[PDB]
Amino acid sequence: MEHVAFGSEDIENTLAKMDDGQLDGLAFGAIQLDGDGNILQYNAAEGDITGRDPKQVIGKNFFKDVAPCTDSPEFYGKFKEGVASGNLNTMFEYTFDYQMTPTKVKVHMKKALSGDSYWVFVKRV
Ligand SMILES: *C(=O)/C=C\c1ccc(O)cc1
């Protein structure tokens, strides 16, 4: 497994050398989003969590199509402000109840090394 801890202070240099294949090795759910909210990478751990099929989520919009739960000032509002400022590093708890049993999760959003690209990390609590 990829021995990287949730909430690490350097996760972005770490998940830079990783391919999608190496991303599944993560002990937590990893989601990469472009600046518009579209999904570029989805990890199986995220899949084990949300039940969504990684292959069928890449290319879609997280806020609009896949996970309407984050369409609130408490998640999306933070993502949009983070994109606008070009710097995001925030952690919080949330509920994912769209087309699924209400599952309590820990969320960590951070700006990736790359210019317009953002990480979403999730792990059950
Ligand atoms: C609300 O967010 C429900 C579900 C959900 C589905 C997929 C992903 O990635 C997160 C959350």
Q: Which residues, at least 6 apart from 82, have a Cβ–Cβ distance to it below 8 Å?
A: 88, 90, 109, 111, 118
24 lines ligand 1 (CB under 6 A): no
Q: Check pocket membership of 49 for ligand 1, CB cut-off 6 A.
A: no
State which residues form the domain around 35. Answer: 1-125
What number does the ligand 1 atom closest to the CA of 98 have?
Answer: 3
- Paired residues of 31 in beta bridges: 42, 120
Buried b (16+ CB within 10 A) or exposed e, 35-61: eebbbebbbbbbbebbebebeebeeee
Residue with tokens 């759910």: 29
CA of 115 to the centre of ligand 1 (A): 25
**What one-letter code names the amino acid at 24?**
D
Closest by CA to 29, choosing from 12, 48, 56, is: 48
**Long-range CB contact pairs, 51-57, < 8 A, 24+:** 51/99, 51/100
For residues 37 and 64, the answer to whether their CB atoms sit within 8 Å is yes
| Of residues 88, 108, 89, the one with CA closest to residue 6 | 108
Number of domains in the chain: 1
> How far does residue 84's CA lie from ligand 1's centre (Å)?
23
Determine phi and psi for 120, rounding to 5 degrees: -125, 115
- CATH classification of the domain holding 65: 3.30.450.20
- Asked if residue 50 has its Cβ within 6 Å of ligand 1, the reply is yes
Q: From which experimental method does this structure derive?
A: X-ray
Resolution in A: 1.6
The amino acid that residue 120 corresponds to is V
Amino acid residing at 64:
K
